[PDB]
Structure formats: structure tokens, C-alpha cells
């Protein structure tokens, strides 16, 4: 999730 | 006349599928629509050679064919672009000559990979001529989790996204196998959303007649 | 050491998602596996930034890094390449240094397009060193009408496939959304097929031992 | 739902 927001 | 593009350097993003169903929705609504296929594999074209489509189909051999669209398909009402699945100049070309850019993204983590690409070529184009843009959720599955993980990504970017999304349905696929679109079948789950999504696009150019 | 490659220019074919679950399954059996990420977006590499990974990750700065494989990853029992979702030099580089080339294809027809350009790169390599080839049906769905079309798309090319198609499940997605394979899930429907698909992959190397 | 269901497979095979 943490990286999902990032993209 | 207005140009419209479906650009997203990633492969399973439903660009082609969207273009067909959306274009049909526009033609059967009165307008005269011409579509330009820019795939080196000519999937949309290979499709058009079978059942009669409701819009006009063309085929590009290079970016030379895209840069001159405002010239060739000028008698038409809308020019749609099925962008190449590659990270080519087509994405660069398209935006250069468009009144609207649609970025198809799917509910997945590996799909938002080069979706960010298009976004920067538009901001980069914003200097010479402001080009509108909207993201398009596609193959929307039922996962609140992933939907937010994308929804958030679609926000940081700084661009709008159509209130409606393209759901995943075995019809959107089954229809391309035969040769029809989605309006050549009784399924009303898709026949509706496409029609609503299309009504949005019409509103966008409605605010260009207002100002 | 041996090299397995997953190539298909088409981006909806699940090349990245397959590798994660097959290589993970390959490590659990006692094998030391290493995977090379050639996608310019580096997906199999970002996903693995989650620690959870039964294999080793090596990113590719260019095709020059895909070529000198046996000179570097020579210590691993296996080296697997996440294909490039673009028509490029990658496909050409891979086949040249492989012992097996797996080609993911999906039910959707227009998803088989580039299945061709690849099959003709192998036909070229046969002149120097024939590279084994197999088609891997992924994201399968019970669509008879649609699967007969894909069943035939393969036949023509004249290459064997896999009696174990990777099915379409939500677990193959959520698992990746957190940073795991499908072996980190209660879901046993998926772990099954892969454990049987992987077995197949090894049989190709037994006939020759 | 009808019309061209084989002509694509048929050609995806040719490619
Ligand atoms: N709304 C949808 N519902 C169900 N299946 C879909 C939908 N949109 C796309 N698909 C399927 O997913 C695949 C990917 O769609 P497609 O439009 O071919 O992507 P692209 O981005 O056009 N692919 P490419 O031309 O290789 O970049 C297709 O083969 C479709 O069959
Ligand atoms: N067996 C499967 N079940 C469910 N979803 C799948 C499966 N295989 C692939 N997908 C999903 O389909 C999308 C495309 O898969 P992906 O593995 O990213 O393709 P790629 O080959 O990685 N694409 P590209 O990098 O453009 O070549 C992803 O969002 C995956 O989550």
C-alpha cells in the first residue's frame, strides 16, 4: 500500500 | 474538429478495448467519428476487417501519420487515437496534436508503471498549448483496497479522472472475439456505463463552447 | 546453471506476475534462484523492495547486463528473466542466452499478437543452438469459445504448451499488492496449479541430465 | 452476439 500511494 | 487520445505505455491497460466501445457510443449518438490505429501489431485494424464498425477506421505507419491528423481527418467530428503499447514517439506525437488526452489505468500495482509517463509529456506540452487530460479506470474489479491504492496515485498526479469507470466483464472481451462492440449485444451493464462515460466527454467540449 | 526466460511484448500477458510465483516455488524445492528485471519501469524489482522474496533480484541497466549472465549468475541453479513488455532488443538478447523460453499468452485474442515475433526469434537461434520453447497459458478462464481460438493460435507455431494453465484469481493480485507471492496466502487453489506447473518446468531438464 | 469469432483466432495463428 505504502508504495501504491507512491506510484 | 477535436482530437482525442488514449495513451498509456502499458499493455493490459485496455486502451484498444476502450477506444472501440467509446467511439461506437459516440457515432451511434450522431457524430461522425474517425479512429486512428497506431499499433505496430494492428490489433484494432485486424478487428475492423470483419464486422462493420460504426466509426471510420484508419491505420498509421509512423508518427508522420499522427502529426498530420488535423489535416487528413478534418471533415470528421472526432479523431480518436489507439496509442501504441510501446514507449515510443507516438505518445509524444499524440499529445502534441490533441484537445483531450485519456490515460487508461487498471486496478493493479504493475500497471501504474509507465502511466506516469504520459502525465509529464502533457505538463511538458502545457508550455506550448494547454492539453486537457483525464484518467480512466478500466477493468474495474471489486477491491476497495486496490481501488484506493490507485485512486490515491491518480490524485498525486494532479489530474482529474472520470466519475465513471469501465468494469471488467466477459462481454467486453467476448464482443471483440466476434467483431461487435458492446452495443451489439443485450448486456445492459456495459451499454450503460459506456454511454454515461461518453456523455462526460461531450461535456468537456461543452465548456469550450461556453468559454 | 540454466536460464529460463519469460518473453512476450504484450503487456497484459502476466510475465512479471508469473515469474514471482514460479521462481518462489522454485526456491522452496531447494533450488537457488536468481531473477533479472529488464523492464525499464522495474516492477519485479520494486515489488521485491518488500523483503519477502525467496529468490534473488538483479535489475538490468541495459541489454549488456542480460548478455553476461553465465559470467555472473553462474552460481545459481537458475536464472530467470522478467521479459520486457516492449518490442525491443531484449527479446533478441534473451533467447541468445537461454536454455528454455516460456511465452505467456492470455485468452483474449488480440493478446496473442506478439506471441509471433518471439517464436520467430527462436526459429533464428536454431541455427547456432536450438533453444527449447513452450507456451504458457496464463489468466485462463473457462471460455470454451475463446480457448479454442487460443488453443489454435498455439498449434500453428508448432510448439508444445503446458497442460497446466495459470488461472485468473484475485489472489495473484492482492498478494503482489502487499509484496508477496501466492505462497504467502491461505488460498490453495493457486498454490496448486503453480506447484504442478513448476514441476513441469523441471521435467524439461530431467530428460537430459 | 455473433459474426466473426474464428477469423481472429485463425489469424492470430498465422502471425
Ligand atoms: N472492461 C474490460 N472488461 C473485460 N476485459 C477487458 C476490458 N478491457 C480490456 N479487457 C481485456 O484485457 C485485454 C487488454 O485490453 P487491450 O485493450 O487489448 O489493452 P491495450 O492497452 O489495448 N493492449 P496493447 O495494445 O497491447 O497495449 C484485452 O485483450 C481485453 O480482452
Ligand atoms: N494469473 C493471473 N491472475 C490474476 N491477475 C493476473 C494474472 N496474471 C497477471 N495478472 C494481472 O494482469 C496485469 C498484467 O500482469 P503483469 O504481470 O503486470 O504483466 P507484464 O507482463 O508484467 N506486463 P508488462 O510489464 O507490460 O510486460 C497485472 O495487473 C497483474 O496483476
Residue numbers in the entry:
A (entry chain Z): 150 to 156
B (entry chain D): 1 to 211
C (entry chain C): 1 to 209
D (entry chain K): 142 to 156
From the paper:
Walker-box partition systems are ubiquitous in nature and mediate the segregation of bacterial and archaeal DNA. DNA segregation by these systems requires, minimally, a centromere site located on the DNA to be segregated; a nucleotide triphosphatase (NTPase), typically called ParA; and a centromere-binding protein (CBP), termed ParB. A distinguishing feature of the Walker-box systems is that their ParA NTPases bind and use nonspecific nucleoid DNA (nsDNA) as a substratum to equipartition replicated DNA. In these systems, ParA–ATP binds nucleoid DNA and uses it as a substratum to deliver ParB-attached cargo DNA, and ParB drives ParA dynamics, allowing ParA progression along the nucleoid.
